[PDB]
Amino acid sequence: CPLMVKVLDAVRGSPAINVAVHVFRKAADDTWEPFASGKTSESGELHGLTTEEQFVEGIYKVEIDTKSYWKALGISPFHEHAEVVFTANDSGPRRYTIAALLSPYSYSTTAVVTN
Amino acid sequence: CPLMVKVLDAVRGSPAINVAVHVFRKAADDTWEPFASGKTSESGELHGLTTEEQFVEGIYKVEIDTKSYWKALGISPFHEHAEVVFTANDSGPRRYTIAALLSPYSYSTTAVVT
Amino acid sequence: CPLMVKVLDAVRGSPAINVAVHVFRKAADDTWEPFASGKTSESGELHGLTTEEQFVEGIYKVEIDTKSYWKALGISPFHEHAEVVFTANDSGPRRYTIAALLSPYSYSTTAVVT
Amino acid sequence: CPLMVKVLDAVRGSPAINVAVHVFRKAADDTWEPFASGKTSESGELHGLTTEEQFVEGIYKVEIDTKSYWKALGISPFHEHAEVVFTANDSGPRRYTIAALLSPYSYSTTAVVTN
Numbered sequence: 001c002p003l004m005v006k007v008l009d010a011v012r013g014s015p016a017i018n019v020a021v022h023v024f025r026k027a028a029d030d031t032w033e034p035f036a037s038g039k040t041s042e043s044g045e046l047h048g049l050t051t052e053e054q055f056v057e058g059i060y061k062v063e064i065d066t067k068s069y070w071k072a073l074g075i076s077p078f079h080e081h082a083e084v085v086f087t088a089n090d091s092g093p094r095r096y097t098i099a100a101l102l103s104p105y106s107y108s109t110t111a112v113v114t115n
Numbered sequence: 116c117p118l119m120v121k122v123l124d125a126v127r128g129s130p131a132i133n134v135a136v137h138v139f140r141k142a143a144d145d146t147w148e149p150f151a152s153g154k155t156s157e158s159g160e161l162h163g164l165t166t167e168e169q170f171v172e173g174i175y176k177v178e179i180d181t182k183s184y185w186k187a188l189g190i191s192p193f194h195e196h197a198e199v200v201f202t203a204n205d206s207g208p209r210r211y212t213i214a215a216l217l218s219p220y221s222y223s224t225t226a227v228v229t
Numbered sequence: 230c231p232l233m234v235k236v237l238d239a240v241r242g243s244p245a246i247n248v249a250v251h252v253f254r255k256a257a258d259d260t261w262e263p264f265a266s267g268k269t270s271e272s273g274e275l276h277g278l279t280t281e282e283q284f285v286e287g288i289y290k291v292e293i294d295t296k297s298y299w300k301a302l303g304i305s306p307f308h309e310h311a312e313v314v315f316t317a318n319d320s321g322p323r324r325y326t327i328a329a330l331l332s333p334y335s336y337s338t339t340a341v342v343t
Numbered sequence: 344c345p346l347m348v349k350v351l352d353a354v355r356g357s358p359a360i361n362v363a364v365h366v367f368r369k370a371a372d373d374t375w376e377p378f379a380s381g382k383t384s385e386s387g388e389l390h391g392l393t394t395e396e397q398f399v400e401g402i403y404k405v406e407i408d409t410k411s412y413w414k415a416l417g418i419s420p421f422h423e424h425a426e427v428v429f430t431a432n433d434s435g436p437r438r439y440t441i442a443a444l445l446s447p448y449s450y451s452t453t454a455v456v457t458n
């Protein structure tokens with residue numbers, strides 16, 4: 001599990017459940033090709049997105065569908081979605097945990113990188 | 116204006132208005148003595164808390180009554196309040212801006228010292 | 230000034246100066262077309278990106294070149310950049326302030342719409 | 344484990360290790376009496392602070408010694424520490440996860456409350 005995503009809800013003090021997450025990898029032609037996708041679990045986490053073998057060096061984009069999440073709660077959010085773009089494995093294989101804390105008009109994201 | 120406080124609402128995407136703010140200075144006996152207080156304006160800001168002469172080196176605590184703010188909106192918040200404790204260094208011309216971004220179960224605070 | 234961007238540095242407790250910001254508007258063919266760009270000032274702010282007349286309803290993307298900012302400080306950041314994608318509603322007099330707080334491996338962004 | 348604290352480092356993209364945490368409970372005389380304390384582990388977490396039986400309703404304060412953490416890294420931080428004050432178990436026993444994301448001049452804290 002080299003790539004993990006965790007999403008929390010700052011309004012309800014709970015994990016953000018059933019949040020759609022799409023991951024893309026920048027292709028040779030500078031285009032974003034689908035890499036993996038999923039929905040956060042009851043704990044606000046998304047595991048099994050990829051494997052060490054498939055997760056090669058490159059630029060990846062993790063898109064979190066925050067809009068659909070807030071609309072389902074009856075809240076009109078500011079952002080269309082939350083995006084996290086980063087170069088991965090440039091100096092060897094690493095484990096990445098992408099965390100996002102969501103509010104209707106704000107979000108924070110941090111990364112925890114392990115060897 | 117050596118010290119300024121700004122509070123934003125992350126739920127409504129607006130300044131946090133009429134939020135009570137209390138500032139304290141740590142006294143010689145390690146006790147918190149009232150220093151200044153006020154309520155954020157329409158722009159979520161609070162100015163004129165103190166002056167350069169009065170704002171001497173020391174440890175200060177800025178307490179933001181976040182609980183009352185959320186209750187007024189019909190939301191049961193997690194925190195009793197938000198506190199920011201810092202040491203005013205004074206070493207060189209410095210203005211302190213304490214910013215807080217509020218959500219019912221979360222808050223972030225940052226300091227901009229220029 | 231319908232749209233304003235403010236960037237702060239959470240590591241140095243100061244405004245993030247000379248940060249490149251690019252704004253795009255989603256075109257009819259679902260493509261991002263350049264809309265406006267600039268660099269944050271000494272106060273970490275970027276004004277005069279657009280006008281009320283030009284800033285019509287639509288989906289906009291604000292891209293903050295955070296990577297170049299950290300590299301200039303000798304720090305290897307995590308993100309390639311920070312992006313804020315939002316729909317300008319226009320329904321009623323509204324000014325948009327996009328604020329970003331930057332750290333090497335984290336950033337927070339909030340919108341203050343008044 | 345009704346009370347858990349997790350601390351992350353936003354500057355290094357890693358858990359904040361060996362961070363001292365002190366917990367207090369507001370006493371009848373409006374005084375803060377020591378309740379529990381510990382240091383974050385290699386994963387930035389602190390477990391076993393208290394038990395369901397001991398964690399009764401009341402106002403608690405979780406103090407995270409962020410200053411010592413940054414000084415050990417050679418960084419002069421803004422805050423003396425980070426404090427989280429909340430009423431707990433007022434409507435029955437709950438599980439609380441207090442998370443903090445640290446930067447020299449900024450910190451964010453969120454709570455995840457479970458039944």
Ligand SMILES: C[C@H](C(=O)O)c1ccc(-c2ccccc2)c(F)c1
Pocket residue numbers: 006008097099100101108109110349350351442443444451452453
């Ligand atoms: C991944 C981890 C978890 O949920 O256990 C986690 C997730 C989010 C935060 C976090 C807390 C406050 C502001 C920004 C991020 C954090 F400090 C730790």
